């Protein structure tokens, strides 16, 4: 199984978690199971608390979700927790969490800054103390979403801006996309006006519908493909284009949203966060979405929304560069 654990700088208060990766289903969130191990000494009168914090570091530290559980003085135990109880011994106090739905996923902006989750344990008589960093643990966990099994409808757009005002129609091969998979678009154009097109601008953007105090819609292009195709009046032109977003050319760009980082290691582009129909839109967190434009300058354009996510992993994401250093 190889359960994960972290020890505090002090020689006590080790915390065991089965996995630092919690699948964020659309309607429910996986519980944060695990146990905390503490010696019989050093806890003669003090009480142990475990706190889960959902923060929005941008350096202050804006708080989103705060949960606290009391372990020693006092719900069924999961299978993983039962095995940890048997192995560690009697002096192990299990703790469980229940993350509410519609919370923002673990995601950071490339320069850290972003949304990070931390599990912290406490040793104090109550919650009104200024504990030191030495007698605590700061373990970062993740809350990520994965591509759904059912594919979505094929995106389609249409614009008729200036006989026939420059008919434009675009479509995608499929709605779902994986990181690194090429994206194919259609630029089927039936021009009829006297004006002719000069350049076809096809780009993939990464919307950051992110709110901390005011709603914002920052635009960050991720991929470009300049086309040198021109058309004549009353002529038909239609050919496919290929795009593949990746981080190699986007390193210089600032403010790009990247997947949650446990350490200073690099991650890929932030996966698109899909929500439920309706619901609130003031979620204090990073919201990533992708779509591709097909702009024809003479300037007509179309928008084709799509989702760029990951398939369901088999065992676990490594959360690090597997061939590190």
């Amino acid at each position: 199984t190889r359960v994960f654990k972290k020890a505090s700088p002090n020689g006590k208060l080790t915390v065991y978690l089965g996995k630092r990766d919690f699948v964020d289903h659309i309607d429910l969130v996986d519980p944060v199971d695990g146990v905390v191990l503490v010696d019989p000494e050093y806890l003669k009168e003090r009480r142990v608390y475990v706190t889960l914090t959902a923060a929005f570091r941008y350096g202050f530290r804006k708080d989103l979700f705060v949960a606290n559980v009391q372990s020693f003085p006092p719900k069924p135990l999961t299978r993983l927790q039962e095995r940890l109880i048997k192995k560690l011994g009697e002096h192990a106090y299990p703790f469980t969490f229940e993350i509410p739905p519609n919370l923002p996923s673990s995601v950071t902006l490339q320069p850290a800054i972003g949304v990070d989750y931390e599990v912290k344990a406490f040793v104090a008589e109550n919650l009104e103390e200024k504990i030191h960093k030495r007698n605590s643990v700061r373990l970062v966990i993740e809350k990520v979403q994965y591509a759904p099994e059912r594919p979505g409808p094929q995106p389609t757009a249409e614009t008729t801006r200036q006989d026939k005002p420059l008919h434009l129609e675009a479509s995608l091969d499929k709605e779902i996309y994986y990181h690194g998979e090429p994206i194919s678009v259609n630029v089927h154009v039936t021009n009829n006006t006297n004006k002719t097109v000069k350049k076809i601008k096809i780009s993939v953007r990464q919307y950051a519908d992110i709110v901390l105090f005011n709603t914002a819609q920052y635009k960050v292009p991720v991929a470009m493909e300049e086309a040198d195709d021109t058309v004549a009046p009353s002529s038909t032109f239609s050919k496919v284009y290929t795009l593949t977003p990746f981080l190699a050319n986007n390193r210089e760009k600032r403010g790009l949203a990247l997947d949650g980082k446990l350490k200073h290691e690099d991650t890929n582009l932030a996966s698109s966060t899909l929500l439920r129909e309706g619901a609130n839109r003031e979620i204090l967190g990073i919201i990533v979405s992708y779509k591709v434009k097909v702009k024809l300058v003479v300037d007509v354009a179309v928008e084709l929304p799509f989702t760029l996510m990951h398939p369901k992993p088999k065992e676990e994401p490594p959360h690090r560069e597997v061939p590190e250093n």
Partner: single-chain antibody
Amino acid sequence: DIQMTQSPSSLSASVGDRVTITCRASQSVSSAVAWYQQKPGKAPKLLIYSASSLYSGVPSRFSGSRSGTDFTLTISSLQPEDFATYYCQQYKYVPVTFGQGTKVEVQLVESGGGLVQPGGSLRLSCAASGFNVYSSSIHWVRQAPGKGLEWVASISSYYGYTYYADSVKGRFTISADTSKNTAYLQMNSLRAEDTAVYYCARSRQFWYSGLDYWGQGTLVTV
């Protein structure tokens, strides 16, 4: 670095028995250990990619286990089409090292290779089909005649990272042609120890899980 030692150098058995191959890691690596099976005159084939997870396609008779650093491979029954060399490979660090070899007793096409005078130059092409360059990581592994597999270089087009072995640093250059879906390896300053069978293999770029697909072989003689 990390040196991986396999306890059975040469194992002999019959059909219908349990054989065990023991692999020892020099450093305390995680479960990121992969097992490969190479028939004579053929490219190695992946069997286990996480020291506990079986690859899709291979029979369930193969299994693996871990205890500290005691990675091992257990085969319940020895079918007639099982006599080959088994290699133990770790991929927790850039200098990936293969085992010494245990003897039991989507298409990738490589081009180029031939008789090259010492001090010359040669270029190897790896025609890759069925997958994208950005969605996979291309690794070059050479096998000296009578010796085990050795890692040469790797390229990750998604992050734009290129890694070279300490013995081929600077003299070797690796490049990938995304338009043609072809990976190119440049060989310069050919010394006498470069005589080996070169294999171009592709691994998943995201969440590295061993070398799934291997090439054929373009051995270079100097």
